[PDB]
Design a protein around this ligand. Structure first.
Ligand SMILES: *[B]([O])([O])[C]([C][C]([C])[C])[N]C(=O)[C]([C]C1=[C][C]=[C][C]=[C]1)[N]C(=O)C1=[C]N=[C][C]=N1
Ligand SMILES: *[B]([O])([O])[C]([C][C]([C])[C])[N]C(=O)[C]([C]C1=[C][C]=[C][C]=[C]1)[N]C(=O)C1=[C]N=[C][C]=N1
Ligand SMILES: *[B]([O])([O])[C]([C][C]([C])[C])[N]C(=O)[C]([C]C1=[C][C]=[C][C]=[C]1)[N]C(=O)C1=[C]N=[C][C]=N1
Ligand SMILES: *[B]([O])([O])[C]([C][C]([C])[C])[N]C(=O)[C]([C]C1=[C][C]=[C][C]=[C]1)[N]C(=O)C1=[C]N=[C][C]=N1
Ligand SMILES: [Cl-]
Ligand SMILES: [Cl-]
Ligand SMILES: [Mg+2]
Ligand SMILES: [Mg+2]
Ligand SMILES: [Mg+2]
Ligand SMILES: [Mg+2]
Ligand SMILES: [Mg+2]
Ligand SMILES: [Mg+2]
Lengths: 196, 222, 204, 195, 211, 233, 226, 195, 196
């Protein structure tokens, strides 16, 4: 799995591959790992598919109930709910989640939640088995306040390499753009990103 | 850890007649839930009117047969082209098997032919060389499915003569080659239905004073 | 160690023309030791017959359990339970112990009193139903019984012919199993008469 | 514990149980009675792990005695054996099962027949003319299979029992220190004081 | 497996069942567990069929070269000892053998028990195999030195039957042998199925079984 | 006893009317890392045999050297080395099968699965498999690893039995192999897009194709897949 | 086991083989792996047979009560959600691997469910020991905008691949078609490519062949009057 | 095998060894002599794993008999015991050690003194007035510690041995089938045929 | 450990970090992992320090003896000797070695020898625990026929990132330049490469 979330001038973009594996067998080659827990709060999922789905479903329930009572929750609040589940059930879970969202006040924000259930707010984050191979590339090429087009290229190039080297990563590159303008879904196919 | 053994499935059947003998076996070769081959011969003409099949781990079975064929060749060289009798072959095979007592050939072997009086003969072996002459014997994966059927239909076990009610047994009348081949085909057709490692094809080798003849029959490929 | 093969035993059932047959061996053992030659494995609740193989304590327990349940069924429904309905009750009762199961191999046999249709069914230790048209097998010689039934069986047999077929299937399977034998019983079941026959077999 | 035997004859049931109690390499006792009277015409012998045996036997005894008082009536040996079996079949799927095998010998006063039941720790019940638990039956069953008749007298049953014990004393490696023998018949339960 | 042998006035009786087992599956019911070493020497097989067969046939070949060299038939004691020393080399390696070496030599009838553990014991009565425990009951109760050949043959046959009935891994048929100073005499193959019913009727035993 | 380190995945093959086809991708994996992208796993022996190898690459390179040495040794004192006494597919296979079984019998195997594809002197097609255990078998179609599970079913639809071989052309057979390689790229997590393909025909000889790519892939339907159940956006 | 699911123009089709195994032995040759959750929501199951049956009957029961409570026809996403949460709770110990398909007021749907509780969406899916053989066929022949007739053909061809090439699969092909605006048609034994050939001999015995000891009439009737 | 005892008195050494041989749950023999005469005035009893015991004993016997023939002279019990110890100390670091414990009882004709040596399978040698191997000494040493005098007669030694055996027969769980007793003195080795 | 060898126009450059660890303790922070087996044939060492030293010593002996008899050995020959040792003793060794050398005929050549004992000739190679983090960076930034200055910068930047992310890598960056001109040793300290 190769997942990442990157903040930029107008907001935040989430990115992910589409491969699910049972050992060396690809159980699903068109997986959607970018999942919605609120209108403009999304998450990237890595680890157990069952665990991360069960978590995201519970979070979507909590934030739906939060909204009915207290109005739109912050991205930090969404990350806190994820954390509470991942930390308190750390013995029984295998979930590496990146939480990303857009406020008008706070703009684009990215929180990463690794295995232990710790939370880390970052300008950008990478996770999944394939992230190991692009720590160098991403650290060298990331800039703050990039444009939408620059950020899309940064994620495309990064995940392209992660897919190239990681067997557990592959298929299409899905992306989700979170800005004031709304929510845009992007997709990039092998013929496009392999030749980069 | 490296496991030097495997299981290639397969099932074999040897039946001895009054002046003939048959050695049958399916042609399917497998590992786990996959099919390797739908037609991979398993019963071989080894010379001197002897047929042989070593069922179980194919690599060990191929090596044993190869070595016995070699043993027949050298028996001719060393003893003036003398014909290797079935009882002599059987004893020789024990020593081939027991030579690896502490790293066995993982196979169940059956040979068939004619004895020195011209009567049908089948010999059965365990992996480490214990052997015995038999009239009827199935070996391999579906052996437990077939043998009880042969006890009933070849040796007439638990069968008595009507009217007497358990007092007089059914008499042990000899079977012809045509009657035997019917029992072989029905045995394998039944085993194919209930055993996943049995199917694809059935190859039968018939041995008489005239020589070794072959017959092939299709089986279900699922 | 394996609960399903400590006591040993076998059960087989077959359909015929307007009839069913169910049969079992009589052995109860403690592994190699033979303990009883009178341990019948076939019970009946009205006109529905149930054979049970496997761990003997569970065989006895389930019989007492289904006697309990079928007696209450009859008091409330004001009629005897049918084979199709009983089959579902067996399945339900076994699956309720999904993660602490009874180590048994049940077999149902009987004729629906209304439709007159012959019915047999088999189960795994957890309740999965195998509703076969031809035959059902269960026990430590199930492989042997599969081979015998699959070769000897033909459809639409008359009661007195079906008797010979099922008996020969059982006897010759039992004689290739160390943990089965020591006697045998065969039930021939018709819409309104049931005959029970004890078979003569080798006692080793 | 070690050896418990039982034989049902014409008009009685005879139970023979070893006298030895052992903890490791030492014989603690050589006069232990491995039996409890459940009712005036029902006796239960037992063998298994230390503690479990006596705890279970006395628990069964208390329940049957309670039933007797409540109804002013003695349960049939068959009813008792079924009660015991259910308790053991209940026990086997519990957190810590009773590791006990039993023989129940009783005289049914209604049918005027002796009855012997063999029940192991799993709750496996069987009615028998003769029975044994553990390694006992391995040595004794061949003699019982040979010599046993259902029309035997009590004295003939005792002689066949002596033969079974003599074979045990020859071929068993363990010294079980002889047996206490008890007879259950129409007149109740009594102990053979010389064996 | 049930095998037995015992010395008596008129030689030694040797009896064995014929069942071979592979788990719960009965592989064979026609096994020769008595081995013909030489016309004056017999050997029983129990445990590993392959092991017992190979080493006892290798023994027979040892005993034969002894005769050529020394112009004399090997003693039962010497034969049993050759086997014991042969299997002792492979001790702990996984061999599984329980055998008796039966014969008549200058010291009269001889009977030695030999196993893969390393035991080698001379005795008047032995029984080895899973069903030995059942056979000993019938032997010990009815064994005398003053036994007729007819009664002795029946005792060994009846003892196997007792074990074949109870032991799940023993059965099939009974093979009988009588060893004299003029050599061993084969006394036939006896199906346990037919033998059981016959003995039940004539003797009255096995009342618990219905027939 | 060892464990495989750098590994090669499926090798697939089939018979057709005039010869055999064999193929394998150019990847050398290091666990889940797709480390080496230019690895040739089809090794020709003369102009009548191609040996396709999967499994441990260090052991493959060893086998490759044994075969190279075999050709050298066969030419020694052999005037008919390029004619009647040239190496046959059956000779090359039996040699490897001998080596594989001997190595497993010393508890030190060559951790490979091998398919020897070729055409004999008399024009007969040769196609046989051997692995680390010394197990051998032959079939109209043969495949190793994942290919056994995914490729064989597809190739068996073309040649289901022996009688289907004369009815199968080289164009049809190559089409089936190339399709199978695409399916393996969809579904095998240790596969690559780049692969090699070899045809050994009794008329046109040995044709060795390098730097082939999986093409005509279907991915467009991925855009319509959203979430894992209830999600609509 | 081979089970598949294929979407088409105006609906969805599922299919399955009919073999049940215990080790190398076939327990049932004509097993029914296609389950009805509701009239227009069907599910194919692989893995532990009792579990796929039990979990399907349970969710189907609760789906029926839900449909009655809400006065609405049940949705596939409801069955999907109820199944995954049930299976997740039992942490994979309930060995049910399901392909869930159906039509409802929202449209046509196709999902897969694994024993640990993970779900997946697709136009074509396959599960079981023969899923690789089936998926090879689906990846080779699937296209967008399939007709009903093309989808049934593709699905049964995928099952056949499993039947012939996977030893865990065999016997017959079962199909269920769920089209929008129509009744779901359950095609039991749609294909039958494995009928056993005639036996060479008849093994019917002469009457009196078996030895008998005792005979007796069994009283199945109740206690009688008078 | 099970119990082997030894006691050195005034003018002799007495060795008592059990008669039973056991393979699992069955007593194969009840008259086994667990001893070999190494020389006319030296006796060795032994106990340990099957095969090893007899193979080792007979190997030692052959070596001492060879020495006797070569030199026409009987080795002292001390010299024999040292030879045996070295063979066992050599054995313990071999690929497969002899699992055998021995007692060597001999009469030294030069010193006119009886001598008893205890040697275990490790090659641990000790000269003693009385000794035992395995679980034997656990039951018997308290009686020997109490009753033993070095000026005892052979008859007094036998009576003390009967007492030791009686205690074993009471408290040991295993039936060892009595003991064969042998006396080693100036006149050689003899067996007590009634014990 | 982070090691790499890169071919360029004028020859080949080897590069390595200087960290040796016993668990989390740095047993040596100024290690020389670039070792000489012949005048212009060097190797990079990763894995067991004892194993790789014992191997390199044996290889240096073989090539010294080769030279006395047959003259200067090729880089391919040196790689073959390494392979023979690593392959035949694979059960008892833990050695990941990169072999690099300069001929006048063949110019710069790089062979990598991973754990199994396989050989792979490449334009450039990376190895060691820290190499995982720069697969993406190196693949994106490597060009053939670079200049000496470009290649030094490429290795410096690459190992800088490998060191940054890998705990088993650190200290100084050592380099060895192999050309027709001769053999040049380079060293780069933390203050220089960390700020890149
Ligand atoms: B990815 O590899 O982390 C991926 C992301 C997931 C949320 C779709 N996970 C998986 O593919 C996991 C296994 C795994 C592989 C590599 C690293 C960590 C975990 N697979 C599953 O959870 C799975 C596989 N088959 C069926 C159902 N679930
Ligand atoms: B007997 O039970 O010891 C018997 C004697 C042998 C000479 C035929 N042995 C076996 O049946 C053994 C298994 C076994 C059962 C009980 C105790 C010890 C061993 N089986 C085999 O030797 C065997 C040989 N070939 C095929 C199948 N089984
Ligand atoms: B298939 O192979 O997935 C199939 C689907 C099932 C719904 C009929 N499964 C089985 O056949 C399983 C295989 C299995 C064997 C052992 C443990 C777990 C799974 N079979 C059974 O569940 C089974 C076995 N015997 C009787 C009844 N059911
Ligand atoms: B590097 O980490 O691979 C390094 C290279 C070595 C040739 C100097 N190896 C080590 O530091 C090894 C342990 C190790 C760490 C990480 C990956 C692989 C191996 N250390 C030693 O060999 C060592 C440590 N302390 C003392 C002696 N040797
Ligand atoms: Cl997912
Ligand atoms: Cl170093
Ligand atoms: Mg990839
Ligand atoms: Mg089949
Ligand atoms: Mg039986
Ligand atoms: Mg009991
Ligand atoms: Mg028996
Ligand atoms: Mg029996």
């Amino acid at each position: 799995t190769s997942i990442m979330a990157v903040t930029f001038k107008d907001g935040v973009i989430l990115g992910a591959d589409s491969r699910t594996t049972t050992g060396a067998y690809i159980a699903n080659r068109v997986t959607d790992k970018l999942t919605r827990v609120h209108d403009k709060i999304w998450c990237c999922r890595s680890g157990s598919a069952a665990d991360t789905q069960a978590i995201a479903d519970i979070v979507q329930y909590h934030l739906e109930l939060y909204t009915s009572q207290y109005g739109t929750p912050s991205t930090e609040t969404a990350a806190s709910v994820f954390k509470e589940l991942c930390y308190e059930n750390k013995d029984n879970l295998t979930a590496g989640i990146i939480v990303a969202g857009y406020d008008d006040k706070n703009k684009g924000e990215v929180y990463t939640i690794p295995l232990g259930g710790s939370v880390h707010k970052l300008p950008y984050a990478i996770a999944g088995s394939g992230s190991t191979f692009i720590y160098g590339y991403c650290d060298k090429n990331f800039r703050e306040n990039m444009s939408k087009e620059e950020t899309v290229d940064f994620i495309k190039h990064s995940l392209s390499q992660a897919i190239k080297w990681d067997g557990s990563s592959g298929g299409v590159i899905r992306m989700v753009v979170l800005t004031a303008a709304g929510v845009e879904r992007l997709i990039f196919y092998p013929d496009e990103y392999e030749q980069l | 850890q490296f496991n030097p053994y495997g299981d290639n499935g397969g099932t074999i059947l040897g039946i001895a007649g009054e002046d003939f003998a048959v050695l049958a076996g399916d042609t399917r070769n497998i590992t786990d839930y996959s099919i390797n081959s739908r037609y991979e011969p398993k019963v071989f003409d080894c010379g001197d009117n002897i047929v042989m099949s070593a069922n179980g781990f194919a690599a060990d079975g191929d090596a044993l047969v190869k070595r016995f064929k070699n043993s027949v060749k050298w028996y001719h060289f060393d003893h003036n082209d003398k014909k290797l009798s079935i009882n002599s072959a059987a004893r020789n095979i024990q020593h081939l098997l027991y030579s690896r007592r502490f790293f066995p050939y993982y196979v169940y072997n059956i040979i068939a032919g004619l004895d020195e009086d011209g009567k049908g003969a089948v010999y059965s072996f365990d992996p480490v060389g214990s052997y015995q002459r038999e009239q009827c014997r199935a070996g391999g994966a579906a052996a437990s499915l077939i043998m009880p059927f042969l006890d009933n239909q070849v040796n007439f076990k638990n069968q008595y003569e009507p009217g007497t009610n358990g007092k007089v047994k059914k008499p042990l009348k000899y079977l012809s080659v045509e009657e035997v081949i019917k029992l072989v085909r029905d045995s394998f057709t039944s085993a194919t239905e209930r055993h996943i490692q049995v199917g694809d094809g059935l190859e039968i080798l018939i041995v008489t004073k005239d020589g070794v003849r072959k017959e092939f029959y299709e089986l279900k490929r699922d | 160690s394996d609960p399903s093969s400590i006591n040993g035993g076998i059960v087989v059932a077959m359909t015929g023309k307007d009839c069913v047959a169910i049969a079992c061996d009589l052995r109860l053992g403690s592994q190699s030791l033979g303990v009883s030659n009178k341990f019948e494995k076939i019970f009946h609740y009205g006109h529905v017959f149930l054979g049970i193989t496997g761990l003997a304590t569970d065989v006895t327990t389930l019989n007492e359990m289904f006697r309990y349940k079928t007696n209450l069924y009859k008091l409330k429904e004001e009629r005897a339970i049918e084979p199709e309905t009983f089959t579902q009750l067996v399945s339900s009762s076994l699956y309720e112990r999904r993660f602490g199961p009874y180590f048994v191999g049940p077999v149902v046999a009987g004729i629906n009193s209304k439709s007159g249709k012959p019915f047999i069914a088999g189960f795994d230790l957890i309740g999965c139903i195998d509703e076969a048209k031809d035959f059902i097998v269960s026990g430590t010689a199930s492989d042997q019984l599969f081979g015998m039934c699959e070769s000897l069986y033909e459809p639409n047999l008359e009661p007195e012919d079906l008797f010979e077929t099922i008996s020969q299937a059982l006897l010759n399977a039992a004689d290739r199993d160390a943990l089965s034998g020591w006697g045998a019983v065969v039930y021939i079941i018709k819409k309104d008469e049931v005959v029970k026959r004890y078979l003569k077999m080798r006692q080793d | 514990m070690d050896i418990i035997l039982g034989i049902r004859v014409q008009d009685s049931v005879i139970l023979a149980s070893s006298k030895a109690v052992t903890r490791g390499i030492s014989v603690l006792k050589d006069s232990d009675d491995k039996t409890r009277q459940l009712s005036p015409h029902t006796l239960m012998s037992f063998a298994g792990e230390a503690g479990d045996t006596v705890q279970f036997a006395e628990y069964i005894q208390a329940n049957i005695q309670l039933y007797s008082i409540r109804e002013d009536y003695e349960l049939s040996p068959q009813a008792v054996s079924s009660f015991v079996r259910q308790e053991l079949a209940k026990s086997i799927r519990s957190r810590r099962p009773y590791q006990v095998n039993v023989l129940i010998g009783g005289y049914d006063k209604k049918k005027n027949k002796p009855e012997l039941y063999q029940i192991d720790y799993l709750g496996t019940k069987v009615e028998l003319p003769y029975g044994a638990h553990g390694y006992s039956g391995f040595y004794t069953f061949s003699l019982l299979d040979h010599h046993y008749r259902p029309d035997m007298t009590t004295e003939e049953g005792l002689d066949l029992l002596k033969l079974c014990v003599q074979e045990l004393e020859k071929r068993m490696p363990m010294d079980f220190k002889g047996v206490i023998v008890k007879i259950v018949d129409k007149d109740g339960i009594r102990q053979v004081d010389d064996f | 497996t049930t095998t037995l042998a015992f010395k008596f006035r008129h030689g030694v009786i040797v009896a064995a069942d014929s069942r071979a087992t592979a788990g719960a599956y009965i592989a064979s019911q026609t096994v020769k567990k008595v081995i013909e070493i030489n016309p004056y020497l017999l050997g029983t097989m129990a445990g590993g069929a392959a092991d017992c067969s190979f080493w006892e046939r290798l023994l027979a070949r040892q005993c034969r070269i002894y005769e050529l060299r020394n112009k004399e038939r090997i003693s039962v004691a010497a034969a049993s000892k050759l086997l014991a020393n042969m299997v002792y080399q492979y001790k702990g390696m996984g061999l599984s053998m329980g055998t008796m070496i039966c014969g008549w030599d200058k010291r009269g009838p001889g009977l030695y028990y030999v196993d893969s553990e390393g035991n080698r014991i001379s005795g008047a009565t032995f029984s080895v195999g899973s069903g030995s425990v059942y056979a000993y009951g019938v032997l010990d109760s009815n064994y005398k030195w003053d036994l007729s050949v007819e009664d002795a043959l029946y005792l060994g046959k009846r003892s196997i039957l007792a074990a074949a009935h109870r032991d799940a891994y023993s059965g099939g048929s009974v093979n009988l042998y009588h060893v004299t100073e003029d050599g061993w005499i084969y006394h036939g193959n006896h199906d346990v199925g037919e033998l059981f019913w016959k003995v039940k009727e004539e003797e009255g035993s096995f009342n618990n079984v219905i027939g | 006893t060892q464990q495989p380190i750098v590994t090669g995945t499926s090798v697939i093959s089939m018979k057709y009317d005039n010869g055999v086809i064999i193929a394998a991708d150019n990847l050398g994996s290091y666990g889940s890392l797709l480390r080496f992208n230019g690895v040739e796993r089809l090794i020709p022996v003369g102009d009548n045999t191609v040996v396709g190898i999967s499994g441990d690459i260090s052991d493959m390179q060893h086998i490759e050297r044994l075969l190279k040495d075999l050709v050298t040794e066969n030419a020694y004192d052999n005037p008919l080395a390029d004619a009647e006494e040239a190496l046959e597919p059956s000779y090359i296979f039996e040699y490897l099968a001998t080596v594989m079984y001997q190595r497993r019998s010393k508890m030190n195997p060559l951790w490979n699965a091998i398919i020897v594809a070729g055409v004999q002197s008399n024009g007969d097609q040769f196609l046989r498999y051997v692995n680390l255990l010394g197990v051998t078998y032959s079939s109209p179609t043969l495949a190793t690893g994942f290919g056994a599970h995914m490729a064989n079913p597809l190739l068996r639809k073309v040649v289901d039995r022996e009688s289907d071989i004369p009815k199968t052309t080289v164009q049809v057979a190559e089409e089936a192999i190339v399709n199978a390689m695409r399916v393996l790229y969809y579904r095998d997590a240790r596969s690559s897009r780049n692969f090699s393909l070899a045809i050994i025909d009794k008329n046109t000889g040995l044709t060795f194709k390098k730097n082939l790519q999986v093409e005509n892939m279907k991915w467009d339907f991925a855009k319509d897949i959203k979430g894992y159940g209830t999600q609509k956006i | 086991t081979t089970i598949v699911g294929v979407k088409f123009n105006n609906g969805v089709v599922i299919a399955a083989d009919t073999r049940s195994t215990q080790g190398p032995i076939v327990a049932d040759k004509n097993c029914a792996k296609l389950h009805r959750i509701s009239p227009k929501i069907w599910c194919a199951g692989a893995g532990t047979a009792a579990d796929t049956e039990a979990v399907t009957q349970l969710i189907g029961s609760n789906i029926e009560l839900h449909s009655l409570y809400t006065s609405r026809e049940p949705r596939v996403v409801s069955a999907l959600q109820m199944l995954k949460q049930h299976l997740f709770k039992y942490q994979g110990h309930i060995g049910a691997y399901l392909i869930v398909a159906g039509v409802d007021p929202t449209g046509s749907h196709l999902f897969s469910i694994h024993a640990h509780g993970s779900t997946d969406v697709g136009y074509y899916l396959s599960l079981g020991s023969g899923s690789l053989a089936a998926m090879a066929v689906l990846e080779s022949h699937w296209k967008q905008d399939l007709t009903k007739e093309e989808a049934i053909k593709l699905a049964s061809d995928a099952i056949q691949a499993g039947i012939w090439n996977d030893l865990g699969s065999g016997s017959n092909v079962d199909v269920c078609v769920m089209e929008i605006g129509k009744d779901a048609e359950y095609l039991r034994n749609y294909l039958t490519p494995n009928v056993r050939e005639e036996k060479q001999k008849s093994y019917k015995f002469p009457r009196g062949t078996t030895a008998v000891l005792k005979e007796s009439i069994v009283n199945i009737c109740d206690i009688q009057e008078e």
